[PDB]
Symmetry: C2
Subunit: 384 residues, 2 copies
């Protein structure tokens, strides 16, 4: 029913390495008097992250944006009034949404373009071979978006099928593979290119004050990844997708939200979020079990590329695994998190780390990812 | 190669009717001294629009949002300082992006939910029959978006395939039909539900000053539409899709843009935009011609559901039509524009007006739409 082939992904991390000590040090500087103050060495140490890559330097986020009409305020309120307006402008203002977005939107296009070309080289293809383009980009408001940018820069054929998304977030790594599978099913001669470019650092907001704000600042890293899916096997084909699985939890939309305020984009996380995704992990084990119910006990997942959102739920996955399964399945996933949470680009990154480590032809593979709204998508496959 | 069946669309306009005289009158009030002032009765009269429907009242856009820390500014600058801050707060501030979005996001979910249920009733289906959901929503930043909202409210099955988009804009009416076609091709038993919900009035910005600003205020209307596509014909099936066509113009990304500023969403239009879409209309005539080149001259489009973006390019379409073709093809399209430009919801709305008017089984149909970035998607079909 479902047959789709996947060449190895191309991963391109953020060039601006931001030390976790630089963030801890920076936020301490931002808010001197705070209740979370003692929690810092404690909270930061639990992440297990020394440093991450960004598409922009920490300065690009923390810096003051300023900019305000002022003249209208001055007029509405002679020489004494001018000194008053200058006294108000001197105060450092946060960056407006367009100020945070502009440079990030540029980085996204650039990193995405690189990853796109990388993906095509790995597949051994030409830019003109691409028939359908799928893009995923969440934290940098743009219309037209990454898809039209790519079709211009690569470039792609004028008749390429453009399929941009912005609300997939963390599930892009599996939802786009599931989608690509369907496209190459409608036409096996199709060449689908998936590009996930995320400047997640756009969520780093210096002003916010929360036990969770610190966690949002420390969690995410920037990346652009890409991969080719085809309806017919290629020597460059690394993995074959056999089934897709979707699961959405009713009444959990507000656990992970991305709010777009006048000062950029905010990612608010409810403490029960992980607990909610644990549900989708159970749902998945059940999916796999029911699918290998008739089949002999021989069937067994040799590779697990999972993206629950954190090490915590990763630990939970290791303990929920049926009977006796290999211990180092979440090795690649865990290795990925130590560099940061790459959201929509996480799955590919993990697939890359798995690939770069060396896999055996025939290895049973499972790709998994959970995302805001609390919806998840899993794929079962076979390594080639 | 491509076989997809489409039940009649459900259209649900904005309940808040805004008279064009109310907008003309309002903007005159906003900007007393202006160069465009004499152009008003002239410019507004060319639109051919008496009034439009909105998901919110004109007041919801024009109203002042206010809201500002203030305390920090006061502290940074006793009783005299307090009177100064109160003197600054008295000035009417524009609404912040979250203030413009919040109520619109609510209207979008509601109108979309209604149109979704309507679409399912027209198809004679149950909410649990839906296998894939496609949503399109451009002017109201939300993550999770309309897709998860719908899966909760309808509700849909936990395993429904969610496919949300926000950057499709005006092309959603054809890009989602093309996409739906591919999905039901991968699995003909599939039931795809498309929902396009747009609060385009979110772009109405009282402050902006441009010959084009007036045009942006006067052009768009709010709508939520929905339709069911299946891989197998149903008694409710109204139209059958046979082919899909895509076309993107290189180096034209900046003609129609949607910028997300701190005070909401802005839609900037370059004067050469229509001239650019004329290109895609030619490209399309050529597509159809090349496709009916071998076939006898008998082949002839009996229904033309087109959405170039305005009456101007509509006139151009009427004059570019090969040989002798029926005069009232753009009748339904033109009828649609007199009520406003519904963007992504335009095509369905036009398909509805065509349907409500009565069509003959066998009528050759063509669906067309152009959208920002300057990309277009056309579909050729046969009425049932």
């Amino acid at each position: 029913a479902m047959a789709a082939y996947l060449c190895a992904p191309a991963v391109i991390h953020g060039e601006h390495s931001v030390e976790t000590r630089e963030i801890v040090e920076e936020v301490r500087g931002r808010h001197p008097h705070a209740p979370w103050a003692p929690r810092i060495d404690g909270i930061a140490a639990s992440t297990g992250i020394e440093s991450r890559g960004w598409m922009l330097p920490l300065e690009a986020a923390v810096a003051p944006g300023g900019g305000g009409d002022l003249g209208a305020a001055r007029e509405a309120l002679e020489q004494d009034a001018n000194r008053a307006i200058a006294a108000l402008k001197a105060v450092p203002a946060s960056q407006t949404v367009q100020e945070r977005t502009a440079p990030a939107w540029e980085a996204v296009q650039a990193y995405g373009e690189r990853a796109a070309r990388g993906a095509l080289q790995i597949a051994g293809l030409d830019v003109a071979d691409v028939d359908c383009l799928i893009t995923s980009n969440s934290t940098t408001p743009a219309l037209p978006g990454l898809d039209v940018a790519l079709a211009n820069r690569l470039p792609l054929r004028g008749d390429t099928m453009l399929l941009p998304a912005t609300q997939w977030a963390c599930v892009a790594g599996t939802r786009s593979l599931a989608l690509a599978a369907d496209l190459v099913a409608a036409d096996p001669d199709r060449v689908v290119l998936v590009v996930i470019s995320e400047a997640l650092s756009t969520t780093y907001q210096p002003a916010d004050d929360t036990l969770e704000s610190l966690i949002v600042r420390l969690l995410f890293a920037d990346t652009a990844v890409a991969a080719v899916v085809t309806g017919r096997p290629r020597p460059e084909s690394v993995l074959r997708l056999d089934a897709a699985w979707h699961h959405t939890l009713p009444g959990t939309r507000d656990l992970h939200r991305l709010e777009t305020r006048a000062d950029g984009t905010h990612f608010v996380m409810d403490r029960r979020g992980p607990r909610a995704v644990q549900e989708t992990v159970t749902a998945m084990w059940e999916w796999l079990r029911v699918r290998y119910e008739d089949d002999p006990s021989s069937w067994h997942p040799d590779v697990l590329l999972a993206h629950p959102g954190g090490t915590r739920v990763l630990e939970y996955m290791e303990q929920t695994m049926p009977d006796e399964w290999p211990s180092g399945l979440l090795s690649y996933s865990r290795d990925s998190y130590t560099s940061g949470n790459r959201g929509g680009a996480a799955v590919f990154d993990i697939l890359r780390r798995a690939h770069d480590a060396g896999q055996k032809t025939g290895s049973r593979a499972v790709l998994y990812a959970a995302a805001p709204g609390l919806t998840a998508t899993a794929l079962e496959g076979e390594w080639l």
